[PDB]
Design a protein around this ligand. Sequence first.
Ligand SMILES: [Ca+2]
Length: 263
Amino acid sequence: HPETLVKVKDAEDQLGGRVGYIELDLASGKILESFRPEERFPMMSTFKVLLCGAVLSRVDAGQEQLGRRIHYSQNDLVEYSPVTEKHLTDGMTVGELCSAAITMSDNTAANLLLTTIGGPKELTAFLHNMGDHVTRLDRWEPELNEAIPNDERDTTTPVAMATTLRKLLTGELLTAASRQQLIDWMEADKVAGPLLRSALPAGWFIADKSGAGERGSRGIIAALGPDGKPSRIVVIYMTGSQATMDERNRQIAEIGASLIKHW
Ligand SMILES: [Ca+2]
């Protein structure tokens, strides 16, 4: 809707820097609206939905096991690890690790999962394998949220991310069981309050994952819809701004309020 596009362009002037936007029909895959659709933005924690996508994929192939118990040391714990910092002696399962990464953006969990598959380039090779020759993860947490200007490392484009998420959520890549699991994790997202969720009305469904970076980087990928079912995929990204994480949060919630108003 033209109005939401006007509000995205307004968000950019307000925040400074760059804002990327795309709205996609879940069933058709049709692009409804867009802004800087083919430009690169640092992925940030949003990549974790792609990681667990890769992981579930190996489970589906009988190569991985969600119940498999992984162990780690205190040197594995990097910044921000609400869950993993609790289970140093326990260990955690691939499942619980994926649950931590998506529902809590646990950075250490994400690192552990990355190891199970061989790291950044392996995740990228997964992306490349499924038709996404644009998205790329190069580093680990937390260096990947660095978002240096004009650095194509750990970046994606709105359209690239949006269509990849769609393939993961609805395609024939992942079994039904795994497609359900991945969206269950995203619906159980607990660290994305002041974004799309804060504009979402009662009755509406939302499965999402947010991200925060340096240099005012901020992002979110979501599957949302009314009537308790998802029907569109929304992807928002921003970086290069000096505005605080609130003025950024507020601009995302507003973009959200607008996509809902002109549904
Ligand atoms: Ca502008």
